[PDB]
Amino acid sequence: AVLDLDVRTCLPCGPGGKGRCFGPSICCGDELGCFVGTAEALRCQEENYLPSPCQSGQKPCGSGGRCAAAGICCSPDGCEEDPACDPEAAFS
């Protein structure tokens, strides 16, 4: 996804920075599954100070949103395992 503005690369998530923020108290590590307000999701607590829309990894999908975590097509309300991307999907 094209860069947002001057301060790209949003706040990672999970271990080190495998994941990142996605919407509401949520996080989705593509190579790091998805956590909504979970332990590996709290990384977004730091996003409460910097709203700055930063680069995301939401590759659209017909699963009511865009791809995200281990094959996860997230929406404005929450994420779900998208067969189109990796879990409920093929042996991806």
From Swiss-Prot:
Superkingdom of origin organism: Eukaryota
Record-annotated disulphide pairs: 10-54, 13-27, 21-44, 28-34, 61-73, 67-85, 74-79
Name this protein carries in UniProt: Neurophysin 1
Protein's organism: Bos taurus (Bovine)
Shown segment, full-protein numbering: 32 to 123 of 125
